[PDB]
Short mmCIF file of C-alpha atoms and ligand atoms in Angstrom, two decimals:
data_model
loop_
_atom_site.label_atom_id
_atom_site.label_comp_id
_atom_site.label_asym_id
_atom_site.label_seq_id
_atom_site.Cartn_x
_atom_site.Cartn_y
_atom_site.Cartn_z
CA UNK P 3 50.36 -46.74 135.15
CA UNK P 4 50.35 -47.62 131.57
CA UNK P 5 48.87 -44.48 129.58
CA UNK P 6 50.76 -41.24 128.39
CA UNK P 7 48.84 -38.27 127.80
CA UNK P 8 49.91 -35.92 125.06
CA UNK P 9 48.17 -32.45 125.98
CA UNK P 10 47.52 -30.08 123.31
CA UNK P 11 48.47 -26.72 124.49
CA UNK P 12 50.19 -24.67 121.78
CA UNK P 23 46.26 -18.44 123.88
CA UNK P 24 42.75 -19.11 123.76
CA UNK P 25 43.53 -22.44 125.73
CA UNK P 26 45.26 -19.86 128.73
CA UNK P 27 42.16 -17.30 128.86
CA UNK P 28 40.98 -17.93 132.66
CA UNK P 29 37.56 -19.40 133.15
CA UNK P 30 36.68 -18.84 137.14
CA UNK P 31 40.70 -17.30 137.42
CA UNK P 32 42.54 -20.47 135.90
CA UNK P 33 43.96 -20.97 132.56
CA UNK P 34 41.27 -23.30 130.44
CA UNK P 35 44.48 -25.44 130.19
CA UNK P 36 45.17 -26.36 133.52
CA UNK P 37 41.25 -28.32 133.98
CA UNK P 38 41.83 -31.21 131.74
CA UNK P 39 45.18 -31.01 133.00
CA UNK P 40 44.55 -31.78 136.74
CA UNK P 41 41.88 -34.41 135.63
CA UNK P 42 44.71 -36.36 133.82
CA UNK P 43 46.99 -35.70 136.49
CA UNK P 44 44.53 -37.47 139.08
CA UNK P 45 43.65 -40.81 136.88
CA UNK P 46 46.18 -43.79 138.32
CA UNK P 47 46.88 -45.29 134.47
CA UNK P 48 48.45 -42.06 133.45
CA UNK P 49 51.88 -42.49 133.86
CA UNK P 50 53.19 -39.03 132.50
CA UNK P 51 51.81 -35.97 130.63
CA UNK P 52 53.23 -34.64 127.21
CA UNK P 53 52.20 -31.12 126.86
CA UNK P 54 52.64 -30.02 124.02
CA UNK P 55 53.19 -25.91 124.41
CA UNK P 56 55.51 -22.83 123.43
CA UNK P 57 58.03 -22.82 125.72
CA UNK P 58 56.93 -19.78 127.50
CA UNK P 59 53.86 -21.50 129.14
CA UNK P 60 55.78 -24.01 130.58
CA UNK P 61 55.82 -22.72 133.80
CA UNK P 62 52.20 -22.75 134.14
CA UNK P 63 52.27 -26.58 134.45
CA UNK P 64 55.56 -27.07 135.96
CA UNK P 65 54.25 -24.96 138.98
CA UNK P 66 52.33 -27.92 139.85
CA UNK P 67 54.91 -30.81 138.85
CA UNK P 68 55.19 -31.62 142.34
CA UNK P 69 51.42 -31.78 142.81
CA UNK P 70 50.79 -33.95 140.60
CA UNK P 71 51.54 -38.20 140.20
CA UNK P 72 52.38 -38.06 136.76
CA UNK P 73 55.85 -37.67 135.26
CA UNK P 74 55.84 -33.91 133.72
CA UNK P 75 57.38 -33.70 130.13
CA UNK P 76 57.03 -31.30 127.09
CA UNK P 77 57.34 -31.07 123.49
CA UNK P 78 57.08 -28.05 120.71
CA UNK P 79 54.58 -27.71 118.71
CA UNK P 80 54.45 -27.84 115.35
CA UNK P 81 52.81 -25.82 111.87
CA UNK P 82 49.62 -27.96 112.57
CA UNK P 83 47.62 -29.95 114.94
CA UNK P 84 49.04 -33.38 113.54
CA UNK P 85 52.59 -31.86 113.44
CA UNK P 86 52.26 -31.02 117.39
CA UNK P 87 50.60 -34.57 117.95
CA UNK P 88 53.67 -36.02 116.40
CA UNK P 89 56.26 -33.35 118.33
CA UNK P 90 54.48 -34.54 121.50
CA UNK P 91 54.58 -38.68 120.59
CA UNK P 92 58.46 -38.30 120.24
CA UNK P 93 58.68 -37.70 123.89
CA UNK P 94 56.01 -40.79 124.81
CA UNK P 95 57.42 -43.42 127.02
CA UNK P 96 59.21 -45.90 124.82
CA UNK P 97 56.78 -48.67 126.57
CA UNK P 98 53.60 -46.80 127.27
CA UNK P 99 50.49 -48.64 126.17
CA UNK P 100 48.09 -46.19 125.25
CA UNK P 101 48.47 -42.34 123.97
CA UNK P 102 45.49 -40.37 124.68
CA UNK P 103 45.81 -37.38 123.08
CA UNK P 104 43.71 -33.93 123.82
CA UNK P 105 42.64 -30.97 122.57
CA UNK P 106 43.40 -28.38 126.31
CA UNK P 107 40.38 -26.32 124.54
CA UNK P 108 38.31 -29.05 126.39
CA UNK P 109 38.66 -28.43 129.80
CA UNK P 110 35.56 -29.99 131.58
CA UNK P 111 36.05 -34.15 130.26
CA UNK P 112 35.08 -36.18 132.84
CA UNK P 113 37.14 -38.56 134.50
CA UNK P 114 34.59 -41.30 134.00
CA UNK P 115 34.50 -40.44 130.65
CA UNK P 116 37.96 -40.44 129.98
CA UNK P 117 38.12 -43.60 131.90
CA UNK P 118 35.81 -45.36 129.08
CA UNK P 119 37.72 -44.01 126.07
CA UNK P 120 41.25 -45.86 127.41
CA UNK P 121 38.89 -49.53 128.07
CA UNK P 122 37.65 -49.17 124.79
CA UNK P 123 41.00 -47.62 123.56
CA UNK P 124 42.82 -50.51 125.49
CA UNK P 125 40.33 -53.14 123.60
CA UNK P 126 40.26 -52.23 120.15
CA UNK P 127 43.46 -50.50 119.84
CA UNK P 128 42.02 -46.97 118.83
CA UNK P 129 39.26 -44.99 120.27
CA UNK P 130 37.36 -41.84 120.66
CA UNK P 131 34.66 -39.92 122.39
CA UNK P 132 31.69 -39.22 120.45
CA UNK P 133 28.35 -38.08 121.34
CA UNK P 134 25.24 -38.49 119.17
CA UNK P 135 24.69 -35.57 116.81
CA UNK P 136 21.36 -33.49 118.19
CA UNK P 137 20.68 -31.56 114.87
CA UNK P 138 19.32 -32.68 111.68
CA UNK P 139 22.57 -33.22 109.27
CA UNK P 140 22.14 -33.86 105.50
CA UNK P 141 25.08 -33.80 103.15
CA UNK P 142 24.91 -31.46 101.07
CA UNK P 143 26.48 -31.07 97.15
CA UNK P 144 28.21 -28.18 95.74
CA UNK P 145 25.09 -27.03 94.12
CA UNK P 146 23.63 -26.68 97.71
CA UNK P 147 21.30 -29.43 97.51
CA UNK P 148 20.58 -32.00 99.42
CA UNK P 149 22.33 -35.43 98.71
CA UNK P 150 20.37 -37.04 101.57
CA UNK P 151 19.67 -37.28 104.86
CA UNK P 152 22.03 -39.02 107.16
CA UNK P 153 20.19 -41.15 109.50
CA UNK P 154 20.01 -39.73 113.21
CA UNK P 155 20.53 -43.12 114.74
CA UNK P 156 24.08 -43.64 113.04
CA UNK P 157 25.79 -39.73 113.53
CA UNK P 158 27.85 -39.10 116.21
CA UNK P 159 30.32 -35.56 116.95
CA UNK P 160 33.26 -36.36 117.89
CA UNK P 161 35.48 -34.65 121.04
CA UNK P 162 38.75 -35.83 122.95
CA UNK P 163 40.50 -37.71 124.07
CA UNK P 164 41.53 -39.60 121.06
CA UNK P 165 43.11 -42.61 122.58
CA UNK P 166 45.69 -45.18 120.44
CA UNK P 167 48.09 -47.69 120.70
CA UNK P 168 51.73 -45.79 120.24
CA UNK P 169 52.72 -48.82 117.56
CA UNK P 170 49.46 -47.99 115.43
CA UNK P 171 49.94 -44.40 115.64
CA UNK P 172 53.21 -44.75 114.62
CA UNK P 173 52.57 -46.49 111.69
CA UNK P 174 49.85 -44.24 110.77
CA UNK P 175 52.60 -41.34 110.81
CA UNK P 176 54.69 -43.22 108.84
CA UNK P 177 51.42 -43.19 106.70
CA UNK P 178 50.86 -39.02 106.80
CA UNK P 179 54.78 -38.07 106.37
CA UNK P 180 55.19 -40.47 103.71
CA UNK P 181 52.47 -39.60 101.41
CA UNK P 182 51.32 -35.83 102.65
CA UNK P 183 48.72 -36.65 104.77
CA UNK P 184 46.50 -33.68 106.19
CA UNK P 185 44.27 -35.28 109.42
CA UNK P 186 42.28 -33.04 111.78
CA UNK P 187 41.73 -35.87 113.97
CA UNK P 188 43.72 -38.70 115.32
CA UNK P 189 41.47 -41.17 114.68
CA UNK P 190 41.61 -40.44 111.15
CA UNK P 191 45.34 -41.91 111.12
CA UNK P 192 43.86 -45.54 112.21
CA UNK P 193 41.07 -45.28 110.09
CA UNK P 194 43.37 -45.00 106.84
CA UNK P 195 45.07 -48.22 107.53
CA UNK P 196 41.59 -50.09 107.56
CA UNK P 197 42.17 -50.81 111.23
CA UNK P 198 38.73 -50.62 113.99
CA UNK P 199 38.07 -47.32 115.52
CA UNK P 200 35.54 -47.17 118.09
CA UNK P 201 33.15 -44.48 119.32
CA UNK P 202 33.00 -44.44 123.13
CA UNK P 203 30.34 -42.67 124.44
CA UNK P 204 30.57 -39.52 126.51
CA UNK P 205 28.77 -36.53 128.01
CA UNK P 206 27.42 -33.55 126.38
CA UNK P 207 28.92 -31.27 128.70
CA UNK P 208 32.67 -32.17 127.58
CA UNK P 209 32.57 -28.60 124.66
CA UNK P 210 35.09 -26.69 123.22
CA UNK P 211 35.45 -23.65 124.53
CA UNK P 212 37.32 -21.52 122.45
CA UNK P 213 34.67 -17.90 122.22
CA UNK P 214 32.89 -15.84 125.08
CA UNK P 215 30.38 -17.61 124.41
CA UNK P 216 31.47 -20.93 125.12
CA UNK P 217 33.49 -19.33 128.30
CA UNK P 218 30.26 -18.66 130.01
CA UNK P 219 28.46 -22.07 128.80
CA UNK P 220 31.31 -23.61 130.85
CA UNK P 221 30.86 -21.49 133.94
CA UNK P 222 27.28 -22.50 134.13
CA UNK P 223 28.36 -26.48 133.85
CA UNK P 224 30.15 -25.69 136.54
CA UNK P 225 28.50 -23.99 138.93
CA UNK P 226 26.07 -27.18 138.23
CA UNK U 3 1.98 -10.50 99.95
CA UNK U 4 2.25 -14.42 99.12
CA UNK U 5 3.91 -16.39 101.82
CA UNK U 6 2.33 -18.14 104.42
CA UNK U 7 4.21 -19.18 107.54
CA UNK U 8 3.03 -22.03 110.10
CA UNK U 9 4.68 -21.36 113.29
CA UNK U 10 4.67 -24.48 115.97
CA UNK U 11 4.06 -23.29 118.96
CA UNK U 12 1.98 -26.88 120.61
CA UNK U 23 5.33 -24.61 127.54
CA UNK U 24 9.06 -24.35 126.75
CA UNK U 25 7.87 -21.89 123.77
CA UNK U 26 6.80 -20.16 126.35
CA UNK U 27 9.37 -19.69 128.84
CA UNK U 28 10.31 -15.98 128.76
CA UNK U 29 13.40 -14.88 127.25
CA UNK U 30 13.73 -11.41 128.47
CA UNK U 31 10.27 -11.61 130.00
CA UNK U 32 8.74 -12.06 127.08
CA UNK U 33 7.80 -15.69 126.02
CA UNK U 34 10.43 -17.41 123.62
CA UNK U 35 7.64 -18.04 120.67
CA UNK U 36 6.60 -14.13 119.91
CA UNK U 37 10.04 -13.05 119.22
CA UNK U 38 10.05 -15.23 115.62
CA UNK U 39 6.20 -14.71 115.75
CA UNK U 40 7.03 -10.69 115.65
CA UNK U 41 10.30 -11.21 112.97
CA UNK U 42 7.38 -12.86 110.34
CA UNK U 43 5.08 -10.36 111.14
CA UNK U 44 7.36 -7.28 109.98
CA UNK U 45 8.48 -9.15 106.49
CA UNK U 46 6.47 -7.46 103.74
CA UNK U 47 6.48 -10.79 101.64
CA UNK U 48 4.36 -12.43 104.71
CA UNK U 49 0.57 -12.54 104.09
CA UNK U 50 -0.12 -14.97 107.04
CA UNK U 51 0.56 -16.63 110.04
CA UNK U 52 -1.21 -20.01 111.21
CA UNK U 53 -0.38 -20.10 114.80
CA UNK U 54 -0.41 -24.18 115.87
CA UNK U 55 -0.99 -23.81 119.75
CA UNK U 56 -3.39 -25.32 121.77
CA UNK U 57 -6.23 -23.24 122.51
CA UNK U 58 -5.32 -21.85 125.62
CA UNK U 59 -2.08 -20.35 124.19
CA UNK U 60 -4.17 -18.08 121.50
CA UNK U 61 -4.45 -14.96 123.26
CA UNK U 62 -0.53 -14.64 123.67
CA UNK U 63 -0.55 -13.71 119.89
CA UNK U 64 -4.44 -12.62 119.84
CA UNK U 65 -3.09 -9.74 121.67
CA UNK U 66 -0.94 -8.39 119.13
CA UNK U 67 -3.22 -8.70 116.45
CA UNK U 68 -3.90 -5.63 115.54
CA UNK U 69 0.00 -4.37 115.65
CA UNK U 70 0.84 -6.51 112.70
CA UNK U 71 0.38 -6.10 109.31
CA UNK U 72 -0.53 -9.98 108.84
CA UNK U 73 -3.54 -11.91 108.95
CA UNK U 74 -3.28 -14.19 112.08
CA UNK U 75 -4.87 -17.72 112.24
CA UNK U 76 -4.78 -20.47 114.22
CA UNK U 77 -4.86 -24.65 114.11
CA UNK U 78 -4.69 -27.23 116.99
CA UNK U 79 -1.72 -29.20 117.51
CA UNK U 80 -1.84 -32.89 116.51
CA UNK U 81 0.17 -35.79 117.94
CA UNK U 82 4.02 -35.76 116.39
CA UNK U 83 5.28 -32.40 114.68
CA UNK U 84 4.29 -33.70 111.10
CA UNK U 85 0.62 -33.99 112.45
CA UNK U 86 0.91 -30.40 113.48
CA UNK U 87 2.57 -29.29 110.29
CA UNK U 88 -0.66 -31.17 108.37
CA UNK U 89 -2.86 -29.54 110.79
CA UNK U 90 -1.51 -25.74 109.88
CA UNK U 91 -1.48 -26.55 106.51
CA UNK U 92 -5.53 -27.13 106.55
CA UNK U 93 -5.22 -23.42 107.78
CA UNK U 94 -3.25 -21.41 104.77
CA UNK U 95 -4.57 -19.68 102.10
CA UNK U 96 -5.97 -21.67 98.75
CA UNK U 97 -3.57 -19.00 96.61
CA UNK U 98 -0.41 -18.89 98.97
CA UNK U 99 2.93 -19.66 96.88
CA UNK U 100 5.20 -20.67 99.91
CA UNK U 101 4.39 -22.04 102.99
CA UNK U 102 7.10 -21.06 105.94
CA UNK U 103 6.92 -23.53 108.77
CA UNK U 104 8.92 -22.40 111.75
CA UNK U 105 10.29 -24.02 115.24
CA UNK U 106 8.92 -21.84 117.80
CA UNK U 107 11.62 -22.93 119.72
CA UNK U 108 14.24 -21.01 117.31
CA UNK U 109 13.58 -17.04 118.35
CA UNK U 110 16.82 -15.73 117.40
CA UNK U 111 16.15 -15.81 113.55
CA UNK U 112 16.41 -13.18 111.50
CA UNK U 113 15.07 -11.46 108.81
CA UNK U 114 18.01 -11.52 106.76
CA UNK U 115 18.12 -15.12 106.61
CA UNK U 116 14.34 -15.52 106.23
CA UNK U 117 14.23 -13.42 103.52
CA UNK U 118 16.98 -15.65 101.87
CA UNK U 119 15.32 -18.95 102.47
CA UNK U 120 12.12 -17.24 101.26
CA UNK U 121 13.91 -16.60 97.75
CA UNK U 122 15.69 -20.13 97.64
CA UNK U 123 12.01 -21.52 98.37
CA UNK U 124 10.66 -19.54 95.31
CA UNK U 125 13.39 -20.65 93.24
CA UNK U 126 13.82 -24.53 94.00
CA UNK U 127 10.20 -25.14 95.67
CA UNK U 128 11.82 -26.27 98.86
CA UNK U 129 14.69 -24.66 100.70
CA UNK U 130 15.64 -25.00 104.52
CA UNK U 131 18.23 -22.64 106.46
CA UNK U 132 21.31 -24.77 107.27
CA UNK U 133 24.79 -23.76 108.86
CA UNK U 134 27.92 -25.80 108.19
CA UNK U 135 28.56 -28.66 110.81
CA UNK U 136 31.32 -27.72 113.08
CA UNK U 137 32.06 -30.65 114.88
CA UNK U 138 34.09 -33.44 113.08
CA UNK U 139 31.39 -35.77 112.32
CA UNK U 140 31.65 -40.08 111.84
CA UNK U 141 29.07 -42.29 110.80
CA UNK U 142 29.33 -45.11 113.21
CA UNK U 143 27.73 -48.77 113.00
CA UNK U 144 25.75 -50.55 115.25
CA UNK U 145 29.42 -52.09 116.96
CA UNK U 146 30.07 -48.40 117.58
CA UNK U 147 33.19 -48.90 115.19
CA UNK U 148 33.70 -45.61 112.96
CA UNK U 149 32.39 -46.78 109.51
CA UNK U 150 33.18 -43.31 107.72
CA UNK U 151 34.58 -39.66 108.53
CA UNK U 152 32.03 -37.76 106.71
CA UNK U 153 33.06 -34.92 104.83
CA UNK U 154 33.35 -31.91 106.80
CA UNK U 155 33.00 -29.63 103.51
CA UNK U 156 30.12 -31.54 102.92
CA UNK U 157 27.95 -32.01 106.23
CA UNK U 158 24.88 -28.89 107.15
CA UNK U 159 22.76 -28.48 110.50
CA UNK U 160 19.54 -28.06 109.81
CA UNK U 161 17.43 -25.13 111.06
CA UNK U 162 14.25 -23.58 110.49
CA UNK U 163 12.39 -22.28 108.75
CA UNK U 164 11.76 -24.94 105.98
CA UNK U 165 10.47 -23.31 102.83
CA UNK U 166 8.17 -25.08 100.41
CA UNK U 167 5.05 -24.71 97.71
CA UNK U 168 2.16 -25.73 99.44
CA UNK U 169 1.35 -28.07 96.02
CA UNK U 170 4.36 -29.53 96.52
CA UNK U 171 3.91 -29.90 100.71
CA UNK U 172 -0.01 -31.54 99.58
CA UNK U 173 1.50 -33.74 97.43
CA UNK U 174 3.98 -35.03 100.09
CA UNK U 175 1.76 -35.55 103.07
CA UNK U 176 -0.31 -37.24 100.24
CA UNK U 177 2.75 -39.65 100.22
CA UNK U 178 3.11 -39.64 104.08
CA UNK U 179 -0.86 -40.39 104.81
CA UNK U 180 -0.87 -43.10 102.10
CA UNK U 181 2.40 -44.95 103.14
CA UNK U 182 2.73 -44.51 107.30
CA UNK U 183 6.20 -42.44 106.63
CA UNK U 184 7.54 -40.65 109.71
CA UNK U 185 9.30 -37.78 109.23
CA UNK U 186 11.28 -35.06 111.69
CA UNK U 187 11.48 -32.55 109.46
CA UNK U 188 9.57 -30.96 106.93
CA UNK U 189 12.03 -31.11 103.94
CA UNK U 190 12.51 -34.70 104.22
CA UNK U 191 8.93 -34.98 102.64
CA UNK U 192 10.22 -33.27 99.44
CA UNK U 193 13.35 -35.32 99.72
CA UNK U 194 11.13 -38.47 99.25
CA UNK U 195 9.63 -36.74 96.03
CA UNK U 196 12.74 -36.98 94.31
CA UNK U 197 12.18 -33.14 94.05
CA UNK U 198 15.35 -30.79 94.75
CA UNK U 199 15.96 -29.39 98.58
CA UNK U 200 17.90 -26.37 98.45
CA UNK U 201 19.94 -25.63 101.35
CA UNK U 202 20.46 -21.57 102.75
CA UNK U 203 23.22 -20.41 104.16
CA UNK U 204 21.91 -19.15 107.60
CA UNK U 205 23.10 -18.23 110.79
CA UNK U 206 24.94 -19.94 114.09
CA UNK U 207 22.65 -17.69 115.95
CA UNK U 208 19.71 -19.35 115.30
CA UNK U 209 20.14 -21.80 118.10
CA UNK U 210 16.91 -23.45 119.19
CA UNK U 211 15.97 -23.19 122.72
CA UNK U 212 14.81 -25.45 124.86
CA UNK U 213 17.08 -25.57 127.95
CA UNK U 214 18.29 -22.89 130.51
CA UNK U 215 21.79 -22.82 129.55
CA UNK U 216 20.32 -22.64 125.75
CA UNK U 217 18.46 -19.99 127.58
CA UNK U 218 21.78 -18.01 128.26
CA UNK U 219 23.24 -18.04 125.07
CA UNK U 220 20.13 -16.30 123.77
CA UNK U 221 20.00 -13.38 126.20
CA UNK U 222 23.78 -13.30 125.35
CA UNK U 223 23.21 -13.24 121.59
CA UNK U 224 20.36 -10.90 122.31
CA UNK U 225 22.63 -8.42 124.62
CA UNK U 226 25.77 -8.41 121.70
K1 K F 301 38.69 -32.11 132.84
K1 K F 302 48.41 -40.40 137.74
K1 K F 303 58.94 -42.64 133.82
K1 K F 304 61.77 -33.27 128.67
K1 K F 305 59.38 -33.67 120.34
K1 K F 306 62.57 -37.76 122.31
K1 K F 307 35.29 -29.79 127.80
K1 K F 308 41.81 -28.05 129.62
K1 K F 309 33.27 -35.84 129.55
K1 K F 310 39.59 -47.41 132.35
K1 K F 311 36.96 -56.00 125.40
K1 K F 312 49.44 -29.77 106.01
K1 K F 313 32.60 -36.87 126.93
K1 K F 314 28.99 -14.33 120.58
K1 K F 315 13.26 -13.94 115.14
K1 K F 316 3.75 -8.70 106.83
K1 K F 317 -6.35 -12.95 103.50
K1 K F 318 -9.39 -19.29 112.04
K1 K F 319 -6.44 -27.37 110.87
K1 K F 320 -9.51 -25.13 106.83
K1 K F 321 16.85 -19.02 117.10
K1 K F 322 10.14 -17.79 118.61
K1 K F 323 19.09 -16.47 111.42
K1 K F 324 13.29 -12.73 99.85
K1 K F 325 16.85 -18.49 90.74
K1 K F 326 4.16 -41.45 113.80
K1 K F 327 19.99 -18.91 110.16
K1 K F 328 22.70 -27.58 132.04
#
């Protein structure tokens, strides 16, 4: 009971897909795995109630941070409140509500192994890079392209240094994994499920009400 | 009047969208463009007389070519089928309805102007390039990375000369760009549309009626 979770939460992540807040899915699935040891959302202070309404529901330890100006400045918000001895953070986006436990099981293994990891799945379009004059550079080969989701799982001492990386030199990541990959050390792709989308428009709302009702 | 499109088309083109099946809606989109002398239907046999049909409500002359084995087959096959004096050929994925005539027209210019053009949106998924030990070898650069879509837009001299290439060297190739690409010769890429999703699955099914009902 090893793993903290820092859950990004902080209102397109509270619009209700089949009545609940998008939020509260990945939530519960955390919530349920026995190597989480305690959730960090990371919210405005005025949703907290939404989780804490289930604290005793739940066998995780309940904890929250403030976000910050950016995605990496709430990542960091939520890894001051980590357990001081927790193994593995496995950070997500709550715009990802339907992860599957399996899959998040494989993403801590691999993060476990190798110290950082992420779920990927392989890209099903046709990518080429592409130079400012709008031409083709090449085309990147199918076999080797993969999109990447959450969680983003890493060891708290490597993500620490690779903060101490971003605030001392400016920094801008979108990712987690992007942290570990500046200090040269392994990040690997674990794979997951196609059905594990962001769902952030309409659109996406109703993609996710079909993959349930599946 | 100089354009010649080969639209693939050789059953899940023909699963209705609507009620209608999925490959007349781009057939019907060509058909209306002014700059479109021709389209070279690539269906098997049976499938004719869904387009047949419609023949005389379109200002276009309608032909057809059998299907061969892999996509580039069927591309080769179409091209035996377009007029000795076209200046672009226009080879479109059934399977992508939704397109429209806006971004036709706009691939059909970048075509004119480069000799080979394709409609591409930017990626929005954070993209890696991962090796074969499923470590992260690079972030690509999200500024930098395009989805592919169809229609791909090239001179049929310059199309000849790279199936020339393909027939005398065994290449395999997905797309029909990627011929050019091998050329050395430029591959411009057009700004399209997130709409133009292809469809091939029910819940790809949804989306379109959704676009279609917005
Ligand atoms: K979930
Ligand atoms: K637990
Ligand atoms: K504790
Ligand atoms: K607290
Ligand atoms: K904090
Ligand atoms: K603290
Ligand atoms: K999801
Ligand atoms: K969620
Ligand atoms: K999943
Ligand atoms: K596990
Ligand atoms: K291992
Ligand atoms: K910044
Ligand atoms: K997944
Ligand atoms: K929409
Ligand atoms: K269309
Ligand atoms: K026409
Ligand atoms: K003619
Ligand atoms: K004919
Ligand atoms: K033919
Ligand atoms: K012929
Ligand atoms: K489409
Ligand atoms: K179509
Ligand atoms: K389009
Ligand atoms: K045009
Ligand atoms: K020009
Ligand atoms: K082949
Ligand atoms: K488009
Ligand atoms: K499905």
């Amino acid at each position: 009971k090893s793993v903290s979770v820092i859950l990004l939460a902080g209102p397109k992540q509270y619009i209700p897909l089949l009545g609940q807040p998008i939020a509260l899915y990945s939530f519960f699935t955390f919530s349920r795995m026995p190597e989480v040891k305690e959730i960090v959302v990371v919210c405005d202070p005025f949703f907290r109630d939404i989780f804490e309404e289930y604290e005793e529901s739940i066998d995780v330890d309940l904890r929250f941070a403030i976000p910050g100006k950016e995605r990496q400045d709430s990542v960091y918000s939520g890894l001051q409140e980590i357990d001081v001895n927790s193994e593995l953070v496995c950070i997500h986006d709550s715009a990802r509500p339907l992860v599957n436990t399996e899959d998040v099981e494989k993403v801590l293994k691999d993060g476990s192994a190798v110290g950082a990891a992420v779920l990927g799945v392989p890209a099903k379009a046709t990518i080429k890079e592409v130079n400012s004059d709008s031409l083709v550079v090449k085309t990147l080969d199918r076999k080797t392209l993969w999109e990447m989701q959450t969680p983003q799982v890493i060891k708290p001492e490597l993500l620490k240094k690779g903060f101490e990386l971003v605030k001392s030199e400016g920094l801008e990541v979108t990712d987690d994994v992007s942290i570990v990959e500046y200090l040269k050390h392994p990040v690997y792709v674990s794979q997951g499920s196609y059905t594990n989308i962001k769902v952030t428009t309409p659109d996406d709302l109703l993609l996710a009400e079909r993959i349930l009702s599946e």
